[PDB]
């Protein structure tokens with residue numbers, strides 16, 4: 001008789017969870033090692049708490065102002081952050097148990113180890129247990145899903161100051177009167193707007209422009225939206241010195257001296273691979289410290305796989321989870337590959353930013369001839385009925401075939417409409433085909449149809465005679 | 468040389484507008500006859516003003532209460548309906564000019580006639596001009612796009628009372644202290660909730676249950692939502708007598724006497740065909756007075772077509788417009804057909820109701836073997852982060868092929884997510900295929916993926932290990 005394959009999984013986030021359970025489903029015995037709180041980033045200090053805080057911020061914002069204030073009185077709502085934090089944390093704790101702890105526990109095929117793991121060789125790990133001492137974990141196959149951590153730049157004086165990373169910001173029980181934010185990452189912007197809406201006077205220090213690595217139209221729309229609601233966005237600005245004196249932060253910048261009660265550093269994230277002793281297992285990493293893998297999540301060592309934020313993969317929990325599931329399949333004798341061709345991405349600012357497929361620049365870089373159309377939101381019925389036309393919907397197609405290969409949008413509910421675009425791309429639809437489909441009038445997603453029609457029709461024909 | 472085809476179009480709503488412009492594009496000369504305001508129903512007294520009022524109502528509602536009131540103070544906002552009405556009307560007037568008047572005017576190929584048309588024979592119309600007198604309009608082909616009007620039941624005393632139809636309700640400059648609503652139609656419910664949120668004490672008299680003709684789960688969720696915010700829903704209730712005494716309505720019902728300041732009658736709509744003298748042109752209508760047509764919008768008379776609410780077609784402006792465009796193609800020698808297989812439908816209540824494709828009952832009626840899954844919103848991350856789990860997402864598939872053939876949902880933003888379902892159905896995707904696609908975490912549309920996964924996975928595996 002054959003013994004169950006011994007699978008070791010380092011981490012307990014989205015990638016590790018998906019892998020652990022898939023491995024067990026495929027008949028393997030799993031030993032999962034986690035050094036901190038079970039659940040990793042998303043449920044504890046990532047997606048979940050941040051989206052909850054953003055929703056609370058949205059309510060506070062709408063109680064403060066709206067496009068209908070001429071007929072509906074508005075007020076400055078009193079905010080009790082302690083109560084909001086308690087509500088937020090209760091849901092986080094509830095989900096951690098329901099989707100992580102409760103599933104890992106009570107399963108004789110899964111052994112959870114509380115400690116920090118490192119490779120001993122390519123078939124075993126050495127674990128420094130949280131309760132002291134060590135333990136060796138032998139394995140046939142191992143999945144590294146250690147995620148990433150907030151990056152902290154070597155700005156003089158920052159290291160020893162009481163600054164915040166996204167974790168401390170989300171866990172704060174008070175809304176600071178003044179919040180300075182260093183960075184222009186998605187995390188930086190989502191938190192910047194949430195705190196602003198909850199009461200903070202926010203100043204964002206962007207080294208370049210917002211969404212510098214994305215299509216330029218995106219950063220322009222978001223920057224204008226932030227400024228419109230009192231958020232200061234200092235472009236091409238960096239702090240050369242950080243100091244904390246007399247109970248406040250003092251930042252020396254290229255724009256002058258800036259003072260704030262709290263400082264959020266959200267420049268980016270780095271892979272958690274330095275404590276893994278990857279060299280002992282022959283696992284190669286790139287210049288950024290990320291573990292190199294192929295579409296099957298296989299590393300340079302045939303018996304070791306990697307998935308999630310500790311690799312070069314896009315940093316989204318749904319990508320990490322999909323990768324973990326497929327890595328487990330391959331660790332158990334299968335043959336699976338991760339396809340990210342129609343991977344959507346959403347930024348939970350207001351308006352939201354959403355993208356899928358190729359941007360014009362990205363297509364060109366890959367030698368693809370394209371054409372595009374950019375429809376401003378003042379052409380979308382839903383936006384007009386809401387009296388909020390900030391934003392746009394951009395479609396990118398391949399020349400000749402007219403196949404839709406990319407969509408970028410800045411608009412309320414962009415995250416919802418982007419999935420229609422994702423399916424259109426997945427099914428290799430042309431813009432003509434998308435435009436000929438029936439869409440509900442007065443929905444934001446109708447904007448996709450309207451934009452598609454502009455490839456063969458005039459903007460003046462939309463919502464009238466563009467069929 | 469050949470002369471331009473003479474096309475007559477009766478009406479100026481979505482169907483007529485799309486047809487008129489398509490006909491001209493195809494080389495025809497158009498004579499469009501309209502007895503009332505240009506633009507018809509949607510822009511003037513339908514979709515546009517109603518969605519604007521609903522958005523205003525949403526803001527008022529959120530300023531009054533939210534799932535985050537434990538940490539964000541709320542207040543009863545003062546409402547100035549005169550100001551809201553002015554804003555609403557200005558957008559309506561703006562859109563009427565931009566998408567209707569400005570496009571019809573200044574075009575030598577289009578002649579707009581202000582009057583009421585009726586058939587003289589199958590090649591001409593007699594028009595009673597609004598300014599007096601008549602005119603004959605000869606045509607080679609004619610499109611009837613006369614729409615429908617609010618139905619008014621023969622309830623004793625109703626006829627002579629100062630009741631409202633959706634038109635008077637949308638045009639009211641005051642929010643009534645008490646509003647009674649007779650009917651359970653989409654129009655009745657959308658307006659009922661809007662007025663309630665803007666300040667009225669609303670009572671809905673439904674002859675049966677809400678969404679009686681739809682899947683039962685829909686009516687149950689909507690009824691619970693209405694009651695949750697103070698809207699009284701009297702099921703299986705009809706008014707046997709209407710009276711207006713001492714400045715108020717007095718309704719005798721099976722539930723007892725009900726008094727209200729205003730009365731909205733929104734039971735349904737009837738086709739505008741009684742004044743057309745259709746018999747003079749040999750155009751057949753059904754028992755409801757609707758004009759009978761085929762998929763090419765052709766009537767019993769080869770030279771006359773019909774599209775929109777005056778036919779048996781679904782009453783949506785996007786359906787009317789699509790039909791008008793295709794009718795114009797056929798009137799000008801083409802061969803087009805309207806495909807409604809993936810037609811989405813949205814109800815702008817909160818939560819919204821959205822459907823596409825077959826419901827279980829509808830599939831069975833057509834001899835299709837099916838299976839389904841109903842995912843309650845407390846299983847959708849976005850709903851949980853919003854602390855509002857009222858609703859559900861239901862998927863209907865064909866047995867054997869596992870092809871998705873229908874989706875019904877009750878949830879915030881259901882109108883946005885339903886389009887993803889529409890494209891999935893259009894592309895004949897199976898639930899497994901839909902479930903294997905990447906969806907953004909914490910978006911309502913992710914609910915489609917989660918529901919799809921329940922066809923092969925347990926609800927406890929969702930957002931964890933259902934891959």
Ligand SMILES: Cc1cc2nc3c(=O)[nH]c(=O)nc-3n(C[C@H](O)[C@H](O)[C@H](O)COP(=O)(O)OP(=O)(O)OC[C@H]3O[C@@H](n4cnc5c(N)ncnc54)[C@H](O)[C@@H]3O)c2cc1C
Pocket residue numbers: 010011012013014015016033034035036037038039040041042043045046047050115116117118145146147148166187272275276307308309310314315316317318319320348908909
């Ligand atoms: C503020 C914020 C907001 C975000 N918003 C979104 C969003 O809206 N949508 C989205 O899809 N993604 C979002 N993300 C990103 C998403 O959270 C991550 O991509 C995802 O959680 C990564 O999952 P993972 O399994 O790769 O890693 P992780 O969940 O980060 O976990 C790795 C785990 O391994 C442990 N570990 C590390 N080294 C060792 C070791 N040597 N031994 C034992 N255990 C070790 C860690 O302690 C941790 O528990 C957000 C992130 C943040 C920080």
Ligand SMILES: Cc1cc2nc3c(=O)[nH]c(=O)nc-3n(C[C@H](O)[C@H](O)[C@H](O)COP(=O)(O)OP(=O)(O)OC[C@H]3O[C@@H](n4cnc5c(N)ncnc54)[C@H](O)[C@@H]3O)c2cc1C
Pocket residue numbers: 441442477478479480481482483500501502503504505506507508509510512513514517582583584585612613614615633654739742743774775776777781782783784785786787815
């Ligand atoms: C309150 C309300 C809310 C709605 N919400 C939505 C929604 O959210 N989404 C959606 O898609 N649909 C919605 N609808 C329905 C949508 O408005 C209609 O289906 C659509 O407007 C019908 O277009 P049509 O061109 O067929 O007719 P219409 O736009 O109704 O116009 C027919 C025109 O012909 C004229 N006419 C009639 N008889 C004659 C004659 N003998 N001679 C000359 N002119 C004549 C009329 O006066 C009118 O201008 C709503 C309707 C109402 C009333």
